[PDB]
Amino acid sequence: TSCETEGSSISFTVEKAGHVVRFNCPSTLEEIKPAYEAGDSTKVCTTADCSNEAALKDVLKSASLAQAEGSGGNDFTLTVDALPEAETSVFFLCQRTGAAVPSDKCGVHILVKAAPQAPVCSAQDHTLELQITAANSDTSFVCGGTFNVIKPANAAKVLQGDSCETEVDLVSLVPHASRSALEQSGLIKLSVTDLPQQQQKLCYRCEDSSQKACKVLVTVSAS
CATH of the domain at 146: 2.60.40.1320
132 and 101 both lie in a single domain: no
CB 83 within 8 A of CB 17: yes
Q: How many domains does the chain have?
A: 2
Q: Report the Cα–Cα distance between both ends of the chain, in Å, rounded.
A: 53
Q: Which of 117, 149, 175 is the last residue of a domain?
A: 117
CB 77 within 8 A of CB 66: yes
CB 184 within 8 A of CB 16: yes
- Burial class from Cβ neighbours inside 10 Å (0-12, 13-18, 19+) for residue 84 reads middle
Rg for the chain, CA atoms, rounded = 22
- Burial class from Cβ neighbours inside 10 Å (0-12, 13-18, 19+) for residue 182 reads middle
What experiment produced this structure?
Answer: X-ray
105 and 134 both lie in a single domain: no
109 and 147 both lie in a single domain: no
51 and 71 both lie in a single domain: yes
Q: Which resolution in angstroms does this entry have?
A: 1.5
Domain range for 134 is 118-223
Strand spans (E) along the chain: 9-14, 19-25, 31-33, 43-45, 53-55, 63-69, 74-80, 88-95, 106-112, 120-121, 127-132, 137-143, 149-151, 157-159, 167-169, 178-179, 187-192, 200-207, 213-220
Cis check: omega of the bond before 34, within 30 degrees of 0: yes
CB 140 within 8 A of CB 188: yes
